[PDB]
Amino acid sequence: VYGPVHIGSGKIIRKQEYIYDRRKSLAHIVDGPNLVKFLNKKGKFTAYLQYLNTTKERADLYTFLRQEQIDTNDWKTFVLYTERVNQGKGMNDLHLFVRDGRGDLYIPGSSLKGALRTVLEGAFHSLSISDSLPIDPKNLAIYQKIDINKELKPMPLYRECVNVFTMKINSDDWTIEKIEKQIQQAYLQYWNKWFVGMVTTPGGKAFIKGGGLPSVLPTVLFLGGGTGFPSKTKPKEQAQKDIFAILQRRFRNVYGKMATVPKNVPMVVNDSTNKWYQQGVCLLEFQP
RNA sequence: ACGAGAACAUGCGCGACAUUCCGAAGAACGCUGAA
């Protein structure tokens, strides 16, 4: 996991749903009911409602708590847990990581299997992949999605990502050497056909200047989300033409209006450490 | 002082045997909008 990886759980929580300490630089992920009943008991529920009515757009919970000056230990009692944060801008949005019924951090094996199937294509019953081992929640830190299209820009999409598996095959259908060779070939194709376009852009120059890409980057996979359209899907020029056509067909606003073929289709992460990072990249190891 | 009188359509018996709700699925893509 050389880059922050977020596997969504279908739940997106707003700024007002959780607390964000800017000075302490930590995000308190809180459940709803505990906070609601705490405010009902302490008389802060009507105050919270008036706060929501006063400022519709920005309703950060931490600023409201500071305005009411509530005790920090009274904050901890309704907080589900806390996470270390990284922002390039209070946070706007937040995407939660996938948690099973018990609540441990884990990457589902289905994500790995789907990524492997996509990269290998170019059936699939023999390759049986199971869930990865549980990970302690402290590795779950909140990162930001940043778009680099000739210029870097922070985005409101903040995502809970992991900080930077048992599998069985049948010998005839799949082989470890063949699948790893195909993974490496797919990564090389991704580098040659699309990564060079981002290298040439000035935003890419800024990214490499700060050492954003790992020096080492073998077997590299795009496990989680935020990786891009070059993944999750040919001659180079024909491929670019197909992506441009499909983007024009689907996204009427950004791509449909503009007729000219961009420099690279598609046109497009900050951490408290000076090194820049990219979302979704992972390094894998297979043992028999 | 009835082609009549008596006379169980009854005895035994498993709706059973064989059967993977399963195979295929990355929670992900565009990155921007307003002032």
Give A214's Cβ-side CA count (13 Å radius).
14
A30: CB within 7 A of chain B nucleic strand: no
Please state, in angstroms and rounded to a whole number, the distance separating the CA atoms of residues A203 and A208.
9
Q: CB atoms < 10 A from the CB of A166, how many?
A: 10
Helix, strand, or coil (residue A129): strand
Span CA (A151) to C1' (B26), Å: 29
Resolution reading in Å:
2.9
User: Which H or E element spans position A155?
Assistant: strand A152-162
**A22, A27, A55, A143 from A153: Cα distances, Å:** 20, 22, 26, 14
What is the distance of C-alpha A126 from the center of its chain? 29
Q: Do the strands A167-168 and A128-129 form a parallel or antiparallel pair, or are they unpaired?
A: antiparallel
Please state, in angstroms and rounded to a whole number, the distance separating the CA atoms of residues A59 and A52.
6
Provide the experimental method for this PDB entry. cryo-EM
A225: CB within 7 A of chain B nucleic strand: yes
Q: Is the dihedral of CA A193, A195, A196, A197 positive or negative?
A: positive
Chain B footprint bases within 7 A of protein beta carbons: 23-32
Question: What tokens does A254 get?
Answer: 């950004």
A113: CB within 7 A of chain B nucleic strand: yes
Peptide bond connecting A288 to the previous residue in cis, omega within 30 degrees of 0: no
Span CA (A229) to C1' (B29), Å: 7
Q: Please answer whether residues A223 and A113 qualify as being in contact, where contact means their C-beta atoms are separated by less than 8 angstroms.
A: no
Question: What tokens does A240 get?
Answer: 């670019």
Q: Please answer whether residues A219 and A275 qualify as being in contact, where contact means their C-beta atoms are separated by less than 8 angstroms.
A: no
A224: nearest nucleotide, CA–C1' criterion: B26
Question: What tokens does A156 get?
Answer: 């409101």
Helix, strand, or coil (residue A258): coil
A174: CB within 7 A of chain B nucleic strand: no
Q: CB atoms < 10 A from the CB of A163, how many?
A: 14
